[PDB]
Amino acid sequence: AVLYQDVNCTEVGSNVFQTRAGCLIGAEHVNNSYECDIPIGAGICASYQTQTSVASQSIIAYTMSLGAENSVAYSNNSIAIPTNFTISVTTEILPVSMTKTSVDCTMYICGDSTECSNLLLQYGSFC
């Protein structure tokens, strides 16, 4: 689904869907907002929908859904105390180190030639 930024697609039917990023040529607009996996821009999120009814290969561009709307019932004398709990392990991954690489000039910059080594020595203290 080609996305043309900042082009109102007066220049490259019914497939367009004018979003505030750009009109998304090739995706069926869908009012039915879901949680989105591909980010497009300005609240629109395309996703792949395999539907065994019509167009088992299609791309839908819905407005991004924030989550289930809630209406907690606050009241000046009503409190809610939990009565049972649940212990819930949740993994959490963190990188700690990358690969300790190392690069040598004369072998990289020069293909083991000597004249190249003369020139690279003429350049200076980059290595």
Binding site: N77, S78, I79, A80, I81, P82, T83, N84, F85, T86, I87, S88, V89, T90, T91, E92, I93, L94, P95, V96, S97, M98, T99
Partner: peptide
């Protein structure tokens, strides 16, 4: 982990609420 570390947080989560008339 490979070039990293993962944690297994054990988190108390209160499950079942039940309204009451406070004061």
């Amino acid at each position: 982990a490979p070039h990293g570390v993962v944690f297994l947080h054990v988190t108390y989560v209160p499950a079942q609420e039940k309204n009451f008339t406070t004061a």
